[PDB]
Amino acid sequence: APTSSIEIVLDKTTASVGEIVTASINIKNITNFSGCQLNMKYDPAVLQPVTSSGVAYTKSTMPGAGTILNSDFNLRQVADNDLEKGILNFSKAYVSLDDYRTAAAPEQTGTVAVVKFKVLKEETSSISFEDTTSVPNAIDGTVLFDWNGDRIQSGYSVIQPAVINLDMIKAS
């Protein structure tokens, strides 16, 4: 695998109507990582995002917690989703960067966010980060920041696509 990366990792390869598929957004070896802004696309006819308690996302709903970006360095969380188009757009980043740098233990690897999806149709369907005019400096729909607040402009792979029911791809 690439040394440094971001990937949408699914917990399932196949799924029937009514199952939940969990998408974990995982980073690996992102130097001095402090936060991100991500633009994720899914097919809203096939998948429906729901919180850990089962509540349908609204325009301001954030993804669930992962294994990093859970510490109290004053986390900033802002979402601007379009549930009709199938777009989750969220920013999640530490604001207390002096304190974060002082801790000297950057969270360079881990799951930054989790999105649970109800499976509405049994057909091949993908989840990917995508560029958007509202975020012009994205790398394939991803903006990663270091602990000085600077954008990380190179050196990580955006590993995609994530696909559910790939074995049904002919029919699509």
Short mmCIF file of C-alpha atoms in Angstrom, two decimals:
data_model
loop_
_atom_site.label_atom_id
_atom_site.label_comp_id
_atom_site.label_asym_id
_atom_site.label_seq_id
_atom_site.Cartn_x
_atom_site.Cartn_y
_atom_site.Cartn_z
CA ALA A 1 0.00 0.00 0.00
CA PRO A 2 1.08 3.68 -0.35
CA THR A 3 3.14 5.05 2.59
CA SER A 4 0.71 7.97 3.04
CA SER A 5 -2.95 7.92 2.10
CA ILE A 6 -6.62 8.61 2.72
CA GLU A 7 -9.16 5.86 1.95
CA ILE A 8 -12.90 5.18 2.32
CA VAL A 9 -12.91 1.68 3.80
CA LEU A 10 -16.17 -0.31 3.92
CA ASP A 11 -16.86 -3.02 6.51
CA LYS A 12 -18.72 -5.14 3.92
CA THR A 13 -18.16 -6.26 0.34
CA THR A 14 -21.76 -7.37 -0.29
CA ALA A 15 -25.04 -6.20 1.19
CA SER A 16 -28.75 -6.91 0.94
CA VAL A 17 -31.55 -4.35 1.11
CA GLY A 18 -31.95 -3.31 4.75
CA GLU A 19 -28.38 -3.85 5.89
CA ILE A 20 -26.10 -1.12 7.25
CA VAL A 21 -22.73 -0.54 5.54
CA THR A 22 -20.16 1.37 7.58
CA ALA A 23 -17.71 3.63 5.74
CA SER A 24 -14.56 4.44 7.74
CA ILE A 25 -12.48 7.34 6.48
CA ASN A 26 -8.95 6.24 7.23
CA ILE A 27 -5.70 8.17 6.93
CA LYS A 28 -2.18 6.73 7.09
CA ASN A 29 1.08 8.57 7.76
CA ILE A 30 -0.17 12.11 7.15
CA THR A 31 2.67 14.18 8.59
CA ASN A 32 1.63 16.42 11.51
CA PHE A 33 -2.06 15.99 10.58
CA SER A 34 -4.49 18.32 12.39
CA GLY A 35 -7.72 18.26 10.38
CA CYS A 36 -9.50 17.92 7.11
CA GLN A 37 -12.23 19.10 4.78
CA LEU A 38 -13.81 16.36 2.67
CA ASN A 39 -16.41 16.25 -0.11
CA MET A 40 -17.95 12.78 -0.39
CA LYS A 41 -20.35 11.55 -3.05
CA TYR A 42 -22.74 8.60 -2.80
CA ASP A 43 -25.86 7.60 -4.80
CA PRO A 44 -28.87 8.65 -2.72
CA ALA A 45 -31.11 6.16 -4.53
CA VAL A 46 -28.92 3.31 -3.20
CA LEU A 47 -27.59 4.47 0.20
CA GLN A 48 -29.06 6.62 3.03
CA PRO A 49 -26.71 8.06 5.69
CA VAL A 50 -27.83 7.64 9.28
CA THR A 51 -26.23 8.55 12.60
CA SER A 52 -25.09 5.93 15.13
CA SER A 53 -28.58 6.21 16.73
CA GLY A 54 -30.33 5.74 13.37
CA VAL A 55 -31.29 9.35 12.60
CA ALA A 56 -31.28 10.40 8.92
CA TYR A 57 -28.66 13.06 8.22
CA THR A 58 -29.72 16.67 7.75
CA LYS A 59 -27.71 19.45 6.06
CA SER A 60 -25.68 20.08 9.24
CA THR A 61 -25.11 16.49 10.43
CA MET A 62 -21.47 15.48 11.00
CA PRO A 63 -20.17 11.96 10.50
CA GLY A 64 -19.65 9.75 13.53
CA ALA A 65 -16.50 9.68 15.57
CA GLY A 66 -13.58 7.53 14.47
CA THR A 67 -10.35 6.76 16.35
CA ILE A 68 -8.57 10.13 15.88
CA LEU A 69 -9.82 13.76 15.89
CA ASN A 70 -11.61 12.92 19.15
CA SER A 71 -9.43 14.92 21.50
CA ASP A 72 -10.29 18.22 23.13
CA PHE A 73 -7.96 20.52 21.26
CA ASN A 74 -11.13 22.56 20.57
CA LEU A 75 -12.44 20.57 17.63
CA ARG A 76 -14.17 22.59 14.91
CA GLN A 77 -16.93 20.63 13.12
CA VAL A 78 -18.99 22.11 10.29
CA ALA A 79 -21.11 20.16 7.76
CA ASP A 80 -22.93 21.37 4.66
CA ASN A 81 -24.55 18.32 3.13
CA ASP A 82 -26.84 17.94 0.12
CA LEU A 83 -28.90 14.85 0.82
CA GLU A 84 -30.86 15.12 -2.41
CA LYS A 85 -27.65 14.94 -4.54
CA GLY A 86 -25.80 12.57 -2.22
CA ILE A 87 -23.05 14.89 -1.02
CA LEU A 88 -21.54 14.93 2.47
CA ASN A 89 -19.27 17.92 2.91
CA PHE A 90 -17.63 18.31 6.28
CA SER A 91 -14.74 19.99 8.00
CA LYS A 92 -13.23 18.56 11.17
CA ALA A 93 -10.04 20.08 12.64
CA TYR A 94 -8.31 20.99 15.87
CA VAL A 95 -8.32 24.74 16.61
CA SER A 96 -6.02 24.78 19.66
CA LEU A 97 -2.95 24.16 17.52
CA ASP A 98 -0.39 25.55 20.05
CA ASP A 99 -1.63 22.98 22.54
CA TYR A 100 -1.76 20.26 19.87
CA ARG A 101 1.82 20.91 18.74
CA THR A 102 2.90 21.04 22.41
CA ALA A 103 1.51 17.53 22.97
CA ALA A 104 4.06 16.37 20.34
CA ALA A 105 2.04 13.29 19.38
CA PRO A 106 0.40 14.06 16.06
CA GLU A 107 -2.48 11.84 14.92
CA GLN A 108 -0.96 10.86 11.56
CA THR A 109 -2.85 7.53 11.19
CA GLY A 110 -6.41 6.55 12.09
CA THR A 111 -10.09 6.82 11.31
CA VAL A 112 -11.11 10.49 11.11
CA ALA A 113 -14.84 9.89 10.63
CA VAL A 114 -17.39 7.08 10.17
CA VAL A 115 -20.55 7.21 8.02
CA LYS A 116 -23.23 4.53 8.39
CA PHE A 117 -25.42 3.90 5.36
CA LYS A 118 -28.73 2.04 5.07
CA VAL A 119 -28.69 -0.07 1.90
CA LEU A 120 -31.80 0.83 -0.14
CA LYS A 121 -31.06 -1.19 -3.32
CA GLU A 122 -28.95 -4.30 -4.03
CA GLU A 123 -26.78 -3.03 -6.88
CA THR A 124 -23.21 -1.95 -7.49
CA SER A 125 -22.67 1.51 -5.99
CA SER A 126 -19.65 3.65 -5.14
CA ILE A 127 -18.62 6.18 -2.51
CA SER A 128 -15.84 8.59 -3.45
CA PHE A 129 -14.32 11.94 -2.67
CA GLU A 130 -15.00 14.39 -5.52
CA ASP A 131 -13.77 17.87 -6.42
CA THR A 132 -16.27 20.72 -5.93
CA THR A 133 -16.14 24.39 -6.95
CA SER A 134 -16.85 25.34 -3.31
CA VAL A 135 -13.38 23.91 -2.42
CA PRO A 136 -10.97 24.75 -5.32
CA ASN A 137 -7.66 23.56 -3.74
CA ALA A 138 -8.86 19.97 -3.09
CA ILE A 139 -6.86 16.88 -4.13
CA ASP A 140 -9.55 14.58 -5.54
CA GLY A 141 -12.07 16.09 -3.09
CA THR A 142 -9.76 16.10 -0.06
CA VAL A 143 -8.04 18.88 1.91
CA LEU A 144 -5.71 17.79 4.71
CA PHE A 145 -4.06 20.25 7.12
CA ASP A 146 -0.95 20.08 9.25
CA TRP A 147 -0.57 21.36 12.79
CA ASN A 148 0.58 24.81 11.67
CA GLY A 149 -2.72 25.14 9.79
CA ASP A 150 -1.10 24.70 6.37
CA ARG A 151 -2.64 22.62 3.62
CA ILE A 152 -0.78 19.41 2.75
CA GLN A 153 -0.36 19.81 -1.03
CA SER A 154 1.22 16.49 -2.03
CA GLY A 155 2.57 13.10 -1.00
CA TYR A 156 -0.57 11.18 -0.06
CA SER A 157 -2.65 8.83 -2.20
CA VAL A 158 -6.45 9.23 -2.37
CA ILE A 159 -7.37 5.56 -2.56
CA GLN A 160 -10.67 5.00 -4.25
CA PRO A 161 -13.34 4.05 -5.12
CA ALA A 162 -15.12 2.30 -2.29
CA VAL A 163 -17.72 -0.01 -3.86
CA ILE A 164 -20.55 -2.07 -2.33
CA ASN A 165 -21.82 -5.09 -4.31
CA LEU A 166 -19.05 -4.88 -6.87
CA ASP A 167 -19.82 -8.43 -7.96
CA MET A 168 -23.12 -7.11 -9.45
CA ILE A 169 -21.37 -4.62 -11.74
CA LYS A 170 -22.53 -6.22 -15.08
CA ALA A 171 -26.19 -5.52 -14.35
CA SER A 172 -25.34 -1.79 -13.84
#
